[model samples]
Target: GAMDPEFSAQLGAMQHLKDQLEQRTRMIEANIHRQQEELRKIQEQLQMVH
Candidate 1:
């Protein structure tokens, strides 16, 4: 369980996506779907080993 591929890929994507969110916040017009994606992303993180 130390370095599973699935979780590792999601982990890396989450880091970049967070930065995209910050950029979106600056533009003040982040898409509505991004919110949904964010929620999904967070849930995915929580279920890493569930």
Candidate 2:
């Protein structure tokens, strides 16, 4: 089947969102281990996230 403009748009949006999520996920994974010494910073991170 040929790709419709609508289908392409959805795929593009999905790709963009997936890229962002993986990058943010990696950042969170990295943050957690270092967070042992910076438990107090968790509150700040939560505040900034909100």
Candidate 3:
């Protein structure tokens, strides 16, 4: 039916959007994790100097 085609298209678009958002989230989390590690190391070094 004509209605099914419209519904299917909308569903596909939603799925694609979700995939893109998830990929973005993963990259951001990885970057944060790396930065946090770097900060931790810097803090440890400062403690040693005190």
Candidate 4:
């Protein structure tokens, strides 16, 4: 299957964008998980004091 150079370039760019988006999404999810853990620890401390 022969593909046009322009089309190939566009497809590659789109795939690259998708990969970048996925990487960012994973990083954001990890950060949210870490934040939730920190919040849980803070709540535990508050409960202990109370």
Q: lDDT values of the candidates?
A: 0.87, 0.89, 0.96, 0.97
lDDT of 2 by residue, 6-47 (tens): 999999999999999999999999988788659877777889
Backbone clash pairs for candidate 3 read none
Model 4, 1-50: lDDT tens per residue? 49999999999999999999999999999999999999999999999883
lDDT of 1 by residue, 1-50 (tens): 78999999999999999999999787665566678899999999999965
Clashes of each: 0, 0, 0, 0
Q: After superposition, how far is residue 45 of candidate 1 from its true place, in Å?
A: 52
Which candidate comes out best when scored by lDDT? 4
TM-score of candidate 3 on Cα atoms, chains taken together: 0.67
lDDT, residue 31, model 2: 88
Candidate 1 clashing pairs? none
lDDT tens per residue, model 3, 1-50? 66798799999999999999999999999999999999999999999983
Candidate 4: where are CA atoms >4 Å away? 1-4
The pairs that clash in candidate 2 are none
Model 2: ten consecutive residues of lowest lDDT = 35-44
**Candidates 3 and 4: which is better by TM-score?**
4
TM-score of each: 0.49, 0.61, 0.67, 0.76
Model 1, residue 35: distance off in Å is: 23
**Candidate 4 lDDT:** 0.97
C-alpha positional error of residue 40 in candidate 3 after TM-score superposition, expressed in Å: 1.5
- For model 3, the stretches where C-alpha displacement exceeds 4 angstroms are 48-50
